[model samples]
Target: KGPVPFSHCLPTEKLQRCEKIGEGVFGEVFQTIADHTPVAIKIIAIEGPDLVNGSHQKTFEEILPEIIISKELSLLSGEVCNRTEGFIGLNSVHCVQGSYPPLLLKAWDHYNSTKGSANDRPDFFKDDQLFIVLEFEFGGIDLEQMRTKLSSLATAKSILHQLTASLAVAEASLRFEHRDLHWGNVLLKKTSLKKLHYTLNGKSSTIPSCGLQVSIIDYTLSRLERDGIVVFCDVSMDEDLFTGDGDYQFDIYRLMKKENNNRWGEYHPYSNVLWLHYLTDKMLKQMTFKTKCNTPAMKQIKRKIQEFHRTMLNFSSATDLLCQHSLFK
Candidate 1:
């Protein structure tokens, strides 16, 4: 619509409103059926002077990098260097300037009344405020919401391999590094397909489905180099991120800092390996398991995770690890 007002660009009345799906540090997300397809729309208020959630809202300079990164990652399915469907696919983005649409406010209120919210109410937004609306393919459930449902050894094993497959492809193809890949950024959806395929360096790779699929999300701290231009989000100023010891996740931040010498602009495959270690720990200790979970082969799954968590760094990259170990069927 060439930068029209939000109401005109995404007339809420035209969309079959579903429900508030989630919210991020960047914006409020809701699901709606568009063109007979289920889609999630993230509406982020931009260029406002007001502090949102006690932090200044990002201006275009901050968001454009994310947009660029997202477009590239979403295009991974088509990229020649490496290809994978595990990256979150993008539909489109809209830059609409206007007040908060009334319909969404109603949804917001409904959500707050029912489920409560972490973000401040969007009632004070002015007509001049600009918003960047992103429409994405509704990847089923996030890891944060799935909680204990993925207790099956087979399902969890498939997921770990799926992630490594995607990460390795991206790392080899684009020198991509997902600096922040905590559980919240992982999404899972039920699937009937037996497996999904990926291509790296012109070689085909497959991941057993096990009735589930994984989609990696969020590139706020991701970095990559294309055409000799390095793109990344600066985290050098974030002392709190590196100083926290609350969980293995916090240590990842510090560890990544050390790996890159605190510079956010370089491509460091080690960062990917670091996060891989973090995921093994997360799945092993914090998640549910199928009571039918193990033998001599009983602790096999847990043992595999334990071994990988400690030895993962020995590999030069995710591709190195995948090449060395037959962790997937």
Candidate 2:
């Protein structure tokens, strides 16, 4: 298959509704679709008056502590220089209007207006600079939505297996860590469940897909590295902060290793025991007041989650003072 093409235009007409998914102090997200393909587009205010230090462009000028240390290392040891790609210290893309850097906004806006539309649209955005546009799978839903809707343990396990595969591909291909990995950043899609035009066992059968499809999204906090060292991006949120780091990759690798070591072995009988625990917990939470017996199910679910957490912590092997073990593991 050939690579997906992208173009530029306004978002207002193509997107039907921007559904709120998840957000934080950093930014907000809108679940948008054009021509029926779903995407969770993030909007972060990296500049402007409401920044951390004070209300001014200077606030965006403060260089982060990590960047200072990196620069010193580069100058003193000449160990490295200008290493990192994508949106880091610089504006995501080049936009003259003083908006959030151009790369992120431009790619997203362009994709929605052009490739995602039903017809071949004109390229209203005439800039010659190229930017990266991500590809998404079909039937993708975010993690929070899956928590509320997925019914069986088998289904959830299938989703995680796919998630791991996707992340591995990204890590291998991009040499980066999607520093922000959460239920919301993940997307799910399932096409095998679509209605079919055939029968089974001499009777009408409505067989849905065996599992939910999942994919990873959002790279605003991603960290790029080279030869086991940090490569800094030129753009800055403030004069003090440079937007690249390498720690996040180690963090993700440790977590995945822990999951593989602890959960990939043979369990009692069910092929997806960890997933079963996840499904049961979600189910118990949704039960009625009269069905209070489900409380035990919640307890069991917590115990399993705790086990997973413990294994991840053990595998991390982190000792740096800057490392906040509790945050990722």
Candidate 3:
């Protein structure tokens, strides 16, 4: 038999009583009950006039590209989840005859909650309707929130270390590049010393230091590098989209382009290294501003940031760059 359809796996009857939890540019998301478990559902209506009198109905042909991209993401997420301990998990995808729907079980409230609760749903789904569902973990606060919550250089360094490590895993082990790595996409979860452990080369080891757990989310705009081939989901019609070499700066330059029409000269991976650099710099600045003290830890963080700034001046891949960084270690 051929592969089973998503609809067959998750029948509509299994998902009972949906409440509108969020809305976005693609579609509206609903929190529903599935087998007495809380599940988050995102529905994207296939646009076009409805078929009338046996006229041609909208088929998957129009949306085939998007469907394939979504499937690729789901597969990549599963791979990443298995390899890493801290990354969020993706359950499955749900598609209809005329629309693409995604159901994310254990969905957490991304906006309101601070601590993850077993009794409450974890906020796992994004505000944007990208036709995917992910496992929601607790104690996740976005970097935007961290700017205010982090008052000491130590706290900032701890979180940044985890975040950098997480990104390194994605780039090195999974051979994936998250095109959209921003403040909002990075999440921080406070961890205890008891739960802190380290893994090197797929083996677990003991680590004495523990403070925050970092998890990166939203891989819709990501690119996967496989067997000397760079695979990306480019549904747009723009031909100039993939012209840049596989460099991190290309992603940042795209974001910059959206704001200003002026094109800066081509930036290699090292030049674009400031994306993480600047964000960490901002975190340190905020911490210093809040405490108003030049502590030893603060000076150390500044030194590390400056060191990385120089490294970015020389081009390097995300994996190589992060692996060699002292922050990630």
Top model by lDDT, which number?
1
User: Worst lDDT window (10 residues) for model 3?
Assistant: 263-272
**lDDT of model 1 at position 187:** 90
Which ranges in model 3 have alpha carbons more than 4 Å from their true place? 1-24, 28-82, 96-139, 193-210, 227-230, 235-251, 255-274, 285-294, 309-315
- Report, for every candidate in turn, its global Cα lDDT versus the true structure: 0.81, 0.34, 0.47
Residue-wise lDDT of candidate 3 within 196-258, one digit each (tens)? 443434544332234666666554455555455554445344446535555443556464344
Per-model TM values vs. the true structure:
0.94, 0.41, 0.58
Q: What would the per-residue lDDT of candidate 2 be over residues 33-87, giving only the tens digit for each residue?
A: 6676655443333334443222222222332322332222222111112111111
lDDT of 3 at 166: 49
Instruction: Please tell me which model should have the higher lDDT, number 1 or number 3.
Output: 1
Candidate 2, position 9, lDDT: 22
How many clashes does the backbone of model 1 have?
1
* RMSD, one per candidate, in order: 1.8, 15.7, 9.4
Best by TM-score: 1
How good is model 3 by TM-score? 0.58
Ranking by TM-score: 1, 3, 2
